[PDB]
UniProtKB/Swiss-Prot annotation, chain A:
GO terms for molecular function: rRNA binding; structural constituent of ribosome. It comes from the Bacteria. It comes from Thermus thermophilus (strain ATCC 27634 / DSM 579 / HB8). One of the primary rRNA binding proteins, it binds directly to 16S rRNA where it helps nucleate assembly of the platform of the 30S subunit central domain. The combined cluster of proteins S8, S12 and S17 appears to hold together the shoulder and platform of the 30S subunit. The lineage of its organism: Bacteria, Thermotogati, Deinococcota, Deinococci, Thermales. GO terms for cellular component: ribonucleoprotein complex; ribosome. Keywords: Ribonucleoprotein, Ribosomal protein, RNA-binding, rRNA-binding. This is Small ribosomal subunit protein uS8.
Swiss-Prot record, chain B:
It comes from Thermus thermophilus (strain ATCC 27634 / DSM 579 / HB8). One of its GO terms (biological process) is translation. One of its GO terms (molecular function) is rRNA binding. This is Small ribosomal subunit protein uS2. Part of the 30S ribosomal subunit. Contacts protein S8 and may contact the N-terminus of Era. The keyword Transferase does not apply. PANTHER family: 30S RIBOSOMAL PROTEIN S2 PROKARYOTIC AND ORGANELLAR, SMALL RIBOSOMAL SUBUNIT PROTEIN US2M. HAMAP family: Ribosomal_uS2_B. Pfam families: Ribosomal_S2. Belongs to the universal ribosomal protein uS2 family. Keywords: Coiled coil, Ribonucleoprotein, Ribosomal protein, RNA-binding, rRNA-binding.
RNA sequence: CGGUAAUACGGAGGGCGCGAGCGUUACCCGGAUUCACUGGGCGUAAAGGGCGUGUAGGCGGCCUGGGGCGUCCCAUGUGAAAGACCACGGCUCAACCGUGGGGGAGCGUGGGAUACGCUCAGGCUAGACGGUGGGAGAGGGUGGUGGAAUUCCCGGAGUAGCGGUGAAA
RNA sequence: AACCGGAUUAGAUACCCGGGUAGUCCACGCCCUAAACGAUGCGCGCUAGGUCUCUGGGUCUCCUGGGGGCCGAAGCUAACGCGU
């Protein structure tokens, strides 16, 4: 069936990037879309777009890396080095605005779902609202 | 004058002995074999030759390496048709890497050009005669194109990177950019400037190599004939 | 560590560390991410249940709408004093003391938000199940039947041994 | 298995030889253990390939399912290894 659609997505992304795929699908949900636009806006993915594959909605995610590196092993640096689910269906996680974590002296980000909607941590700090600590990236 | 020359018979080569990293540089799998897209061969060939120019004119050094049957002799030509060093017989471990120390063998080779024609030409305990003058053999055999290399090269040109992977790994360790004629065995990713072609067809090797040496001279004036290399073709 | 050259025992010289103390023993936290929530693991190191069926329990796909229980925000009440913390001060300093300030989860009250989780009401077909057609199989249960071989009984024929072991008995 | 003999051996409650009861076989009811081993719990998604093979389907040099094996990308592991 699938137990965590979001966590699965972060993974699909995680997995694709380490073999340096140019693209991945992930079956489509509006909540998935909302997370994607953050990655997109915050510079981790080139972007997503909707497609229908074998007749059903997916989101084609376009990944984004670094320049071919110098010595032995020229594999590019990852743009997404670390994407990680936090609030799993087993143990749901909620920070209030006072407890919103700052991922990696700011160089990171924490997608975080609120009643004002899906937000980065700074977005949500600024809007002054906590919620379900979704995951974190950097 | 390229275009159809390669399409002579020097497009596609190896079959289902591949490396899926090469999926890009392939057109189709006709009659069981892999057939490589030439449009893409050119796309790369320019960029690759354009590399050659920019460092040829700057007066660089390319180290040529070919050791397959089908290369070998065609390397000691075009390389020498360029004053550029070559490895032909067998890639010695640490040629780029232990260089200083492998060089000590050249330091000690040309001590024999000296005693070739010297007062030491028909004398000394004459069992030493042959052994010393058959020591130069091993020496002349392997370090033919290598004696010229007096400093680490600025590039290496390879004809089979999965055959010559030991050389390549040495390159990249030293950041020496890797240029290579390479087909569907080889892993592109560790070939910097790629000539996706045919590691085997003796024709192909020449069509490409000779023409690449041409730019090495064109970048210093005075190109000539179709060049002293048409093989024992039959 | 000690068995005749002991920087490890006992002593002396010297040196190190503390100092009106210095050691010892007991106990608590630490280091110990060595019960791991933060923060661990299970092929061979300790660690996958002998295998299933499915009870309670945990967990739940895509879309929409209602409710606002989880969750989040604002206000407000409570959070005694002492203590801890920051300042300034009073005993010649300090220990001790005084005055003032600052927070805070948690819970109550009123208001508000609805992305996620919950719930209610509809939808959908990618999960699951089913329909029709086709397939391989020492999967199980019951009855039945076949040839080879061993042992025994009966007959023919035939004679001094067979058997067994490293060799024998 | 046991036990009764014969050997072997310094001894030989053994290994070898000759016998031999329970048992192994069946019916019914118990027992519930094991190196009950892939020493690897179940399910689902994702992440190069090559090769051998069992069993389907298809346009039948190949493709496409479901099994059984080996080598091996990325990665993992203390290592050995594991690696659709």
């Amino acid at each position: 069936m699938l137990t965590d659609p979001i966590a699965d997505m972060l993974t699909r992304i995680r997995n694709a990037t380490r073999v340096y795929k140019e693209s991945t699908d992930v079956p489509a949900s509006r909540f998935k879309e909302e997370i994607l636009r953050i990655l997109a806006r915050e510079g981790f993915i080139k972007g997503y777009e909707r497609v229908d594959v074998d007749g059903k909605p997916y989101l084609r995610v376009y990944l984004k890396y670094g320049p071919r590196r110098q010595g032995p092993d020229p594999r590019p640096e990852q743009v997404i080095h670390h994407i990680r689910r936090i609030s799993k269906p087993g143990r749901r996680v909620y920070v209030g605005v006072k407890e919103i974590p700052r991922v990696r002296r700011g160089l990171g980000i924490a997608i975080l779902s609120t009643s004002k909607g899906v937000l980065t941590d700074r977005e949500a700090r600024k809007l002054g609202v906590g919620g379900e600590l979704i995951c974190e990236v950097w | 004058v390229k275009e159809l020359l390669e399409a002579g018979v020097h497009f596609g080569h190896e079959r289902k002995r591949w490396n899926p990293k090469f999926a890009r540089y392939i057109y189709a799998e006709r009659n069981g074999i892999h057939i490589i897209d030439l449009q893409k061969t050119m796309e790369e060939l320019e960029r690759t030759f354009r590399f050659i120019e920019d460092l040829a004119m700057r007066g660089g050094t390319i180290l040529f390496v070919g050791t397959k049957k089908q290369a070998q002799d065609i390397v000691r030509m075009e390389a020498e048709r360029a004053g550029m060093p070559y490895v032909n017989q067998r890639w010695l471990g640490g040629m780029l890497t232990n260089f200083k120390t492998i060089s000590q063998r050249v330091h000690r080779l040309e001590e024999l050009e000296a005693l070739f024609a010297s007062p030491e030409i028909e004398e000394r305990p004459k069992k030493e005669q042959v052994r010393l003058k058959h020591e130069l053999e091993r020496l002349q055999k392997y370090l033919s194109g290598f004696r010229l290399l007096k400093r680490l090269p600025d590039a290496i040109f390879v004809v089979d990177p999965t055959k010559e992977a030991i050389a390549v790994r040495e390159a990249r360790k030293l950041f020496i950019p890797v240029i290579a004629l390479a087909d569907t065995d080889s892993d592109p990713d560790l070939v910097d400037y790629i000539i996706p072609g045919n590691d085997d067809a003796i024709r192909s090797i020449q069509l490409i190599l000779s023409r690449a040496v041409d730019l090495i001279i064109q970048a210093r004036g005075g190109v000539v004939e179709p060049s002293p290399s048409y093989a024992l073709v039959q």
